[PDB]
Design a protein around this ligand. Structure first.
Ligand SMILES: CCCC[C@H](NC(=O)[C@H](C)NC(=O)[C@H](CCC(=O)O)NC(=O)[C@H](Cc1ccccc1)NC[C@H](CC(C)C)NC(=O)[C@@H](NC(=O)[C@@H](N)CCCNC(N)=[NH2+])C(C)C)C(N)=O
Ligand SMILES: [Cl-]
Ligand SMILES: [Cl-]
Ligand SMILES: [Cl-]
Ligand SMILES: [Cl-]
Ligand SMILES: [Cl-]
Ligand SMILES: [Cl-]
Ligand code: NA
Lengths: 99, 99
């Protein structure tokens, strides 16, 4: 799609049967979801946001569907006021910003 | 321009006659800079991101030059890991996300 930015750019995502919504954030290096579970071991990571640091679980090479497009990449699970899709997965959609 | 997202989308902008770099940030409602003093009156606000909330000065009516356009808009000054250009200004460019 072509998405204008008058409202927040929210798309549907799906991870192993969990259907959720998330924000396309070109200021995010990484993808951070709160309302999802993923199986097995993770790597604990601290990440930086505008308001401070947060502890997340890092899961690698996760299959995920974003606005109906299947991609694979790292997903971080932890507290956030909004689910966020970062550049790590937006590059897999071939996303561009046009300005 | 049309840019991919393999790197951070960083651009130079002129804010109140001063040049700074900043990240084009579709997941930001607002434009937030930390390395700059602006003149005149402001109002105290708070922004929220991943880590929590930060106190900012809200400066309305700031002249800005960005991507060849001359615009007037609001800038929030306060502490941020990176300067960020949000949707308040991207919309004035007619910016879009495409994939
Ligand atoms: C004036 C007041 C009114 C509006 C005010 N609105 C806000 O507070 C809105 C919701 N907040 C936002 O839109 C803020 C930005 C600030 C702003 O726009 O004001 N956005 C954000 O903070 C969004 C995520 C988010 C989105 C929506 C809601 C909540 C959080 N992330 C932007 C942020 C920018 C980065 C440079 C630190 N990115 C990150 O936090 C990501 N972090 C990363 O990518 C890390 N690798 C670190 C990068 C550091 N870079 C560097 N050092 N150069 C993370 C998501 C993995 C309100 N109170 O409602
Ligand atoms: Cl919105
Ligand atoms: Cl969608
Ligand atoms: Cl495991
Ligand atoms: Cl980080
Ligand atoms: Cl603060
Ligand atoms: Cl504005
Ligand atoms: Na002014």
């Amino acid at each position: 799609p072509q998405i204008t930015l008058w409202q927040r750019p929210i798309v549907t995502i799906k991870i192993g049967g969990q259907l959720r919504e998330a924000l396309l954030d070109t200021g995010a290096d990484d993808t951070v979801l709160e309302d999802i579970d993923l199986p097995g071991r993770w790597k604990p990571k601290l990440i930086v946001g505008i308001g401070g640091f947060v502890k997340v679980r890092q899961y690698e090479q996760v299959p995920i569907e974003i606005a109906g497009h299947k991609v694979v990449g790292t997903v971080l699970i932890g507290p956030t006021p909004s689910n966020i899709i970062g550049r790590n997965l937006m590059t897999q959609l071939g996303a561009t910003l046009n300005f």
